[PDB]
Amino acid sequence: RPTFYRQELNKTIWEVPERYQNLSPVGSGAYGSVCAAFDTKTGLRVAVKKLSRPFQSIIHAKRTYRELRLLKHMKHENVIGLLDVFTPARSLEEFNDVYLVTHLMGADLNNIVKCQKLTDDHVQFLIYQILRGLKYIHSADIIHRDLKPSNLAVNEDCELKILDFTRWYRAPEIMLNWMHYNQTVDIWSVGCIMAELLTGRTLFPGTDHIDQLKLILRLVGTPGAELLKKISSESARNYIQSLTQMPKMNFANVFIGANPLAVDLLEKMLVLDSDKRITAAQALAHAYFAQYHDPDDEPVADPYDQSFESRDLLIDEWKSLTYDEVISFVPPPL
Numbered sequence: 359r360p361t362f363y364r365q366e367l368n369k370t371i372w373e374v375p376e377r378y379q380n381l382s383p384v385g386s387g388a389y390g391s392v393c394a395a396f397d398t399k400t401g402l403r404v405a406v407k408k409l410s411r412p413f414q415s416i417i418h419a420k421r422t423y424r425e426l427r428l429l430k431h432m433k434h435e436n437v438i439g440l441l442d443v444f445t446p447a448r449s450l451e452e453f454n455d456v457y458l459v460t461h462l463m464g465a466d467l468n469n470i471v472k473c474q475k476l477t478d479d480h481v482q483f484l485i486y487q488i489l490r491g492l493k494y495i496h497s498a499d500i501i502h503r504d505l506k507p508s509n510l511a512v513n514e515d516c517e518l519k520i521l522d523f524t525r526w527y528r529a530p531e532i533m534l535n536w537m538h539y540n541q542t543v544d545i546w547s548v549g550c551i552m553a554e555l556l557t558g559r560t561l562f563p564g565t566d567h568i569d570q571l572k573l574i575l576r577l578v579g580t581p582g583a584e585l586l587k588k589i590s591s592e593s594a595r596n597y598i599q600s601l602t603q604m605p606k607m608n609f610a611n612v613f614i615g616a617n618p619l620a621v622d623l624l625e626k627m628l629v630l631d632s633d634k635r636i637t638a639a640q641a642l643a644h645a646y647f648a649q650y651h652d653p654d655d656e657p658v659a660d661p662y663d664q665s666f667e668s669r670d671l672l673i674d675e676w677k678s679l680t681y682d683e684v685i686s687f688v689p690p691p692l
């Protein structure tokens with residue numbers, strides 16, 4: 359076992375191995391506190407996240423287990439992965455805190471889009487990396503569900519990683535509460551992200567769920583006959599069909615000046631009918647990315663056992679299962 363040292367950083371206390379030095383808080387939220395640190399063993403700057411109230415309830419306990427299982431499974435250049443996971447606890451009884459460690463990512467796409475106006479070549483590279491990580495994630499039967507600029511970490515090399523796998527980036531089927539949305543919800547988010555990088559403006563800055571939908575339908579037009587035929591909720595259908603019908607706009611006109619290849623990709627990404635959205639694997643082959651697309655270098659993920667998501671367990675079982683995952687963690691080769 360390693361040796362730990364203790365310090366209070368912004369109200370929260372931190373107990374971590376000596377190997378992690380010069381802890382410096384980077385931001386907080388409902389997820390937990392994150393500190394930047396220097397890792398003496400590897401020589402790398404790392405981010406250390408302390409989970410907040412990881413076993414407060416069954417929801418929190420399952421969530422803590424899900425995140426650890428999820429992060430332990432991601433080994434991909436464009437997805438946040440685990441360098442280390444630890445707890446100061448020596449036994450299961452005293453297990454109450456979980457610490458996650460990954461390569462420090464200095465910025466996100468919000469501090470890059472609002473602070474600049476991306477050139478078409480930088481858009482190609484950034485979006486290509488997103489789709490490359492999304493192919494890997496989707497190959498594991500995982501849906502991100504919450505893709506947005508602040509969930510895409512970027513460093514100075516413009517290397518990008520997905521993390522955390524009104525919402526201006528949410529697919530309309532979710533705005534409408536369709537219970538069977540598929541992985542193409544993530545593609546819709548990518549489309550909204552790409553559009554923002556090209557124009558510097560939020561594509562759909564809705565103020566609520568209703569306003570969000572009107573903004574979407576203003577651009578992509580109201581659902582056609584084939585799409586309405588797939589809506590079971592009578593309420594949702596009645597609403598939709600009762601709106602002042604609107605036509606699909608010419609994307610080449612909305613995104614005037616942009617690269618015609620980028621516009622064609624947006625049209626295939628921002629399709630209302632989810633059965634017809636381009637998939638991540640298909641987008642990677644789109645001509646827009648011809649400069650970066652390497653089919654032998656866009657790998658898929660090993661199988662991911664999600665059977666736990668339907669289990670109804672007590673807090674101590676979720677806690678014990680999490681402890682099992684901390685103890686059994688094997689770091690990645692240096």
Ligand SMILES: CN1CCN(c2cc(-c3ccncc3)c(-c3ccccc3)nn2)CC1
Nearest residue numbers: 405406407458459460461462463508509522
């Ligand atoms: C929208 N917000 C959602 C929450 N978030 C983060 C960002 C980071 C992070 C910070 C810096 N470098 C890398 C990752 C981490 C994190 C995950 C595992 C280990 C350590 C840290 N967890 N959550 C910030 C963006």
Ligand SMILES: Fc1ccc(-c2n[nH]cc2-c2ccncc2)cc1
Nearest residue numbers: 530531534536581588589630631632
């Ligand atoms: F106005 C809209 C906006 C989006 C959709 C939609 N796109 N993909 C799936 C759906 C959908 C929505 C509600 N119920 C079933 C399916 C349907 C109508």
